Amino acid sequence: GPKCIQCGQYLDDPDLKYGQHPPDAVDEPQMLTNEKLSIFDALPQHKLTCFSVYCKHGHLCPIDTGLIEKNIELFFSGSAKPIPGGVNGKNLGPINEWWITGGEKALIGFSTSFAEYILMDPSPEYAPIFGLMQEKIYISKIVVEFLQSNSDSTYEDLINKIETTVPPSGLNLNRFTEDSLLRHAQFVVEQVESYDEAGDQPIFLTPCMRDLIKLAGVTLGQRRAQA
Numbered sequence: 726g727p728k729c730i731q732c733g734q735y736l737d738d739p740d741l742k743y744g745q746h747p748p749d750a751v752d753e754p755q756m757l758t759n760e761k762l763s764i765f766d767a768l769p770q771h772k773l774t775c776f777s778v779y780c781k782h783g784h785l786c787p788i789d790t791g792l793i794e795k796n797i798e799l800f801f802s803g804s805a806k807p808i809p810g811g812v813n814g815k816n817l818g819p820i821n822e823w824w825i826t827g828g829e830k831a832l833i834g835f836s837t838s839f840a841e842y843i844l845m846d847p848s849p850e851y852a853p854i855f856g857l858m859q860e861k862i863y864i865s866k867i868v869v870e871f872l873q874s875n876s877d878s879t880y881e882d883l884i885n886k887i888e889t890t891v892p893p894s895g896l897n898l899n900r901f902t903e904d905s906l907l908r909h910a911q912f913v914v915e916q917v918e919s920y921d922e923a924g925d926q927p928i929f930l931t932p933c934m935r936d937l938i939k940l941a942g943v944t945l946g947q948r949r950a951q952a
């Protein structure tokens with residue numbers, strides 16, 4: 726059958742899910758405007774709950790399969806609060822970047838051109854897709870996040886950060902060991918390099934990255950041997 730030219734999902738797939746929003750849901754521009762008036766009565770981050778992520782045609786999509794980085798537009802919806810009653814938003818974005826943020830729990834966050842959103846609970850329709858978050862891309866975000874904030878980090882510091890990071894339960898991920906990192910060494914170093922080559926001291930040069938780059942060149946078993 727025919728595919729969506731945005732996300733590649735089959736239109737006639739019985740598992741295909743569309744985004745839903747309550748009738749009073751508004752635009753990101755509408756939401757941010759209303760908000761300006763409320764603080765008049767500056768630019769904080771938002772909590773976003775009962776959230777969904779989708780392509781421009783409304784197909785529910787993964788955050789982490791490369792769509793964003795390929796410059797395919799991902800839109801999102803949910804109930805937003807600036808930062809424990811929210812405002813219903815729909816077709817927010819697109820997402821320019823997703824990232825990790827923190828009590829030792831690493832939460833998914835989105836940047837649009839206008840605002841930042843910390844993701845709380847998925848909508849029940851989105852939950853199984855959010856649940857398919859991969860270990861390697863989440864680990865990558867943790868790595869990138871940890872090295873931005875700690876430019877002098879050693880490999881031991883990194884493994885510690887990884888081992889103690891609890892994924893939120895919506896991600897449906899096991900706790901991480903040193904093996905979680907080692908098994909994805911190559912993917913991780915590609916992600917760190919990609920981050921460095923994209924914007925603006927590079928995290929690729931951090932002492933612990935030197936170690937990871939080297940471990941990326943050895944068989945998985947031999948990486949483990951060095952654990």
Ligand SMILES: OC[C@H]1O[C@@H](O)[C@H](O)[C@@H](O)[C@@H]1O
Pocket residue numbers: 824825826834836841870
């Ligand atoms: O750690 C959280 C921060 O990560 C950065 O990479 C993003 O640009 C910010 O939007 C975010 O607040």
Ligand code: NA
Pocket residue numbers: 855856857858859860896897898
């Ligand atoms: Na998962």
Ligand SMILES: [Zn+2]
Pocket residue numbers: 729730731732733734780781782783784
């Ligand atoms: Zn689509």
